[PDB]
Amino acid sequence: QPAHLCFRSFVEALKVDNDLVEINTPIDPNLEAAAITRRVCETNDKAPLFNNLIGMKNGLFRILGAPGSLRKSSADRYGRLARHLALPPTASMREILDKMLSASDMPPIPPTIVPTGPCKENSLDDSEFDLTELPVPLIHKSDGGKYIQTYGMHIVQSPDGTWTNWSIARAMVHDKNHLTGLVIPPQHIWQIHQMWKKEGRSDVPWALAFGVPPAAIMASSMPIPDGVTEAGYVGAMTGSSLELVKCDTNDLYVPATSEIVLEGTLSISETGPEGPFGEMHGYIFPGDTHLGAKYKVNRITYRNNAIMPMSSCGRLTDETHTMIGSLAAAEIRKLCQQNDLPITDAFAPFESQVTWVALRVDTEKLRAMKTTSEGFRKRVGDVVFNHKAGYTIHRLVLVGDDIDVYEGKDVLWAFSTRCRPGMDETLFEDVRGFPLIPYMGHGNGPAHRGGKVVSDALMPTEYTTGRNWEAADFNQSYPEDLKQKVLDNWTKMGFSHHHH
Amino acid sequence: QPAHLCFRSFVEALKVDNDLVEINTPIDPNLEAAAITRRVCETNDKAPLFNNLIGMKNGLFRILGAPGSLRKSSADRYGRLARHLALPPTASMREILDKMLSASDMPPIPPTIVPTGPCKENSLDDSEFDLTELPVPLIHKSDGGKYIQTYGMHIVQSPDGTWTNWSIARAMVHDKNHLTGLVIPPQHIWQIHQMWKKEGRSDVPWALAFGVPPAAIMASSMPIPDGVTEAGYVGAMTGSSLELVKCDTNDLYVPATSEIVLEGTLSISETGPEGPFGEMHGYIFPGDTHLGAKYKVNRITYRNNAIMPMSSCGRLTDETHTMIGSLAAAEIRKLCQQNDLPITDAFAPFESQVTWVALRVDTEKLRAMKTTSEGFRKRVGDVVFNHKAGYTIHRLVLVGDDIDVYEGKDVLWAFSTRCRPGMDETLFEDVRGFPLIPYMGHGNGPAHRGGKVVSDALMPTEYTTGRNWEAADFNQSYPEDLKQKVLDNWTKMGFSHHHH
Ligand SMILES: Cc1cc2c3c(c1C)C(C)(C)CC=[N+]3c1c([nH]c(=O)[nH]c1=O)N2C[C@H](O)[C@H](O)[C@H](O)COP(=O)(O)O
Ligand SMILES: Cc1cc2c3c(c1C)C(C)(C)CC=[N+]3c1c([nH]c(=O)[nH]c1=O)N2C[C@H](O)[C@H](O)[C@H](O)COP(=O)(O)O
Ligand SMILES: O=C(O)C#Cc1ccccc1
Ligand SMILES: O=C(O)C#Cc1ccccc1
Ligand SMILES: [K+]
Ligand SMILES: [K+]
Ligand SMILES: [K+]
Ligand SMILES: [K+]
Ligand SMILES: [Mn+2]
Ligand SMILES: [Mn+2]
C-alpha cells in the first residue's frame, strides 16, 4: 500500500529516506520514549521507532515519535509532511498547503467499505484489556495522566448520519476502560457532541483510530468546513477512495489499515479529570486539572506488531506547530480569498509559537480597492477572527508582495519595521479567544474572549501608488551584473551546498 | 600598540584571528566594495580589507568593511566586538556590555596630550585635497551621495570647553571641501550644535577621525550620559589614558593613531542635501533627500597607507545592529537599575531589527514591590522612553528570570505566549519617536512622536507568588537522571562540536 494511504508503509518510507532510528533495546514509556522524542523535535533529528517498549504485551504496542516533525536539512525540511501526501520530499510549504487545500473545490470521493483489513488482525473484548496495563506513555513529567492519544483520529458522526468528522484531540487514560480528553468549542468533535446532548437519548458512538493513513491524519488536523466529512475530502485530495472497515461494536467505519482501533462511546453526561498536559505553546501548569469529556472503551482491535504514533509536544518544533499552525494558515488563506480579500499566501510563523499568521497581500489588487489601513485591518480581522479557522490565531500580520511569509525572519523584519504599534493595529476583544495560550487561560483577562489583533505591516504607499523603497540588502541595493560578479569571485577572493 | 587602542593593530588582530580577507586586486569603491561587505554581513563571513581601491592616490585610502559584524561560529560570534575591548574572542554579549558599562561608576581617566602621532604622517591643506577625488564609497545603489563617514568619530566640544563629545553620525560628500550629514535631536552632536547656535558667534570647531582606537569607536556608538566626555570614559574602561594629538587648524584633540583626520567646522547657519541612505532598519527610500547639517573641511591628515573603516549597513547583521542596538540596551539596563527597577539584563533582539529591547526582571524583587502589570509597565516605559537612551527603541518586552534576553528565539517565545495583545501592553504616544524606523518617518502618524509600547510578558503569578509553570521542553519536562541517560546514549542509539 502507498505510504500516504497506510501508516505501516509510511514507517517504511521514513526508513528508506534515512529518516528513522529504530531502537530495539528496552525503552520505558514512562518519560523515556517522550524524552528521546522531545530531543528529536528540538534538534530536527530522525524520527524514533521504539520496537521494544517496556510493558508491551500481546502486540500492544511499539511507538513512532515525531511523525510530522522537521528534518535537519533545508532542502527536505518538510519531507515528513510530504511523505504524508505522496509529494516529493523536497516539497515546499506552499506545495504542501496547496495539496491540503486542493480538495476544497473538488467533488468529494466517498470512502469504499471493505469487509476486513489489517486492523482486524487482533481483538480484545470488554474482559480482555485494561488500558492501565498498556505501555501508554507519560509524555511530560508533570502531565496529569498517560496520554495515549496524541496522533490518532477521533471518529464521530452527527445524529442524522450526514456528517462523519475525523479530528485530532488529546486524550489520556482515566481507568481500565475510560479515557478523558479535551472536547472544546468550536471544534467539530464538540459541535457533534452538542448535537447528541441536545437529542438526549444516548451517548455518542465513537471510535479512535491510531496509525491511520497519513493523508487522513493531515486532514484530521485541518479545520476544513463545518459539515464536511473528512474521508471524502481526503479521497478527493489523494484521487482515491479510502478503504474503511466497520467497527465491530458500532456502525462507524475506520481505515482498514489502522494500527490500533478503540471502539466505544463519548458520554453526553459524564466528565472526569483531564490534564494538565505539556501543550503546543510550550508550557505545562502542574496541578491545573479540570473536568474533560469522558470516553468509554468497549473493544480494541489492532494490527499484528501494532505501532502507536506519538507527538511529544511543547517547545519548537513538533506536530502541534508544523500541522496545527500550517493547516490553519492554509484554511485562513482560502477563507480570505472566498471573502474577496486579496491574500495570496498565509503561514503561521514558528517564531510566534504558531499564534500569529502572516498574510501576504496582492498589493496591485489592494490598490484597486482604494481603501485604508484602518478599514482593511477591520475587514480582515472580522472575516478571520469570527471564523473557526481563525480560532487558534491571535495576531494577523498583513505584509506586501516582497515578503515570503514562509520565512519567519522576513515576517519578523516586516512586522518590526512596517507596523507602528497601536496606530497600525486593531484590537479585537469581542471574538472567541484560544484559552490554551498562556496569556489567555492563565492570563490577566477572560480566558475565552478577546486578546486578538490585526497588525498592518503594509506601508502607506502600498494602498495608493505602490512600494516606494528598495531593501538595503545585497539582493536589492546592487545591480545584477555586480551581484553576479561578486558571487562569481566569492571563493577566489577567500570567502566561504544546497542538499546538506 | 594594543588592538583595542590602535586601529592598525586591530586590523592585524583580525588577520591573526583568521577573520580577515585581504583583497589586493582592484576593487571599485562605486558599489563593489560595499556589495562585498554587504554579502559578508548577511553571511557572517570574514571582514574584507580592500588594499587596492580604484581611485586611491597618495595614500588615501584602503577600506576595511564589516569592522563590528558577526563571525559565523557560535563560540566566537561576537569576537570582532571583543577585539575592540581587549576581551577574549569567546566573550559573551553580557561580558561585552558589562565592559562597556564598567566605567559608569569609575572616575574618568582624562586623555594624555602627546606632541605627535601616526595621524600626522601626511597632510593635505585647503589647496591640495578634493573630497570628490577620493575613493569614497557609494554604499547602496540609490544613496543620495558617497558616504565617506560610516565608522569614524565626530569630535565637537561645548562652547564652555567642559564637554568634548565623540559620536558616530553618518555623513556624505557634498563638494570638494564639504560634507553633509545627520545631526538630529536628542543626539549629543545636535545638543552641542544647539549650544553654538544659541551663542551665535561662530561655526562649531570640528574634527572627524576615522580608524580610531576600537575602544573609542565603541563608546562613540553608546549613549553614555549627557555632559560626559567619551575620552575619559574610555580611559576608565580600558584602565589607560588615551593618547591624543592636537589638530593643526583648531584646538580639538584627536587619537594619536587615527588613520585619517578631517579638521574643519560644523555650520551653525548652512545646510545642504543629505541622503537618502540605506539605513539600519533595512530600507532606502530613493529620492527621499532632505536638508542636513553641513561641514566644511579645512585640512586632512593621515597615516601612511591609511585605512578607512566602512559599515555597509542595512538588513541583518552589521554594526548598526551589533553596536547601536546592544549598546543602547546596555545603557537602558543601567538606567532602569538607577531608577530602582528590578532589571538584571537588557538586549535589543536582532530579529526586531533592534527596535525592541527585552528587559529581564528579577521577579523576587518584583514580588516584593507588590505591584501590578499596568503600574509596572507604566513605570518602566516612563523611565526609558523619556530618556535619550530609549530613543531608538519602540517596544520594551518585560520577561521573567527564566528567559535569556540575549537569545532571540526565547524572547520571541515569551513575547508570543505571555503578553496578551492590548491588555498586557501600554502605548506611549507622547514620547519622542525615532523617525528612521519606516513606520515612523514614512508611516501613518507623526514622524517624531509616539509609536512606542511596553509589552508585559511577565505572567500574573510572577507579580504575586512565583512562576507556576514548567516548560514543555527537554530541559524542564524530564528529570535530570533521565536527561543525562538520553544524552549519554544519543549517538549509541543512532542520532546526531562547540568550537565550529
Ligand atoms: C496535530 C495535532 C492537533 C491537535 C492536537 C495535537 C496534535 C498533534 C495534540 C494531541 C498533540 C495536542 C492537542 N491536540 C488537540 C487538537 N484540537 C483540539 O481540539 N484539542 C486537542 O487536544 N488539535 C488540533 C485539531 O486537530 C485541529 O484544530 C483540527 O482542525 C480539528 O478538526 P475539526 O476541524 O474537524 O474539528
Ligand atoms: C554604530 C553606528 C552608529 C550610528 C550610525 C552608524 C553606525 C555604524 C552609521 C553611520 C552606519 C549609520 C548612521 N549612524 C548614525 C548614528 N547616530 C546618529 O545620530 N546619526 C547617524 O547617522 N549612530 C548611532 C550613534 O552613534 C549612537 O546613537 C550614539 O549614542 C551617539 O553618541 P552620543 O550619545 O554621544 O550622541
Ligand atoms: O494540548 C494542546 O496543546 C492543545 C490544543 C489545541 C486545542 C484546540 C485547538 C488546537 C490545539
Ligand atoms: O542611517 C541610519 O541608519 C541611522 C541612524 C541613526 C540615527 C540616530 C540614532 C541611531 C541611528
Ligand atoms: K479535521
Ligand atoms: K503599517
Ligand atoms: K557616544
Ligand atoms: K503578561
Ligand atoms: Mn472537521
Ligand atoms: Mn556622548
From Swiss-Prot, chains A, B:
Binding-site residues, Mn(2+): N165, H188, E230
Single GO MF descriptor: manganese ion binding
Record-linked Gene3D superfamilies: 1.20.5.4570, UbiD C-terminal domain-like (3.40.1670.10)
Active site per the UniProt annotation: E279 (proton donor)
Keyword flag Cytoplasm: yes
Catalytic activity: (E)-4-coumarate + H(+) = 4-vinylphenol + CO2; (E)-cinnamate + H(+) = styrene + CO2; (E)-ferulate + H(+) = 2-methoxy-4-vinylphenol + CO2
Pfam families given in the database record: UbiD (PF01977), UbiD_C (PF20696), UbiD_N (PF20695)
Superkingdom of the organism of origin: Eukaryota
Effect in UniProt of substituting E274Q: Abolishes catalytic activity
Subcellular localization: Cytoplasm
Cofactor(s) named in the record: Mn(2+); prenylated FMN
Cellular component, GO, one term: cytoplasm
Enzyme Commission number, as recorded: 4.1.1.102
Entry's Gene Ontology BP terms: aromatic amino acid family catabolic process; cinnamic acid catabolic process; ferulate metabolic process; styrene metabolic process
Disulfide bond annotation, renumbered to this chain: none
Keywords: Cytoplasm, Decarboxylase, Flavoprotein, FMN, Lyase, Manganese, Metal-binding
Signal peptide bounds: none
Outcome reported for the amino acid change (mutating R170A): Abolishes catalytic activity
Primary enzyme class: lyase
Positions with a binding annotation for prenylated FMN: N165, W166, S167, I168, A169, R170, Q187, H188, E230, K388
Quaternary data: Homodimer. May form higher order oligomers.
Similarity comment text for this entry: Belongs to the UbiD family. UbiD-like/FDC subfamily.
UniProt function note: Catalyzes the reversible decarboxylation of aromatic carboxylic acids like ferulic acid, p-coumaric acid or cinnamic acid, producing the corresponding vinyl derivatives 4-vinylphenol, 4-vinylguaiacol, and styrene, respectively, which play the role of aroma metabolites.
Protein name (Swiss-Prot/TrEMBL): Ferulic acid decarboxylase 1
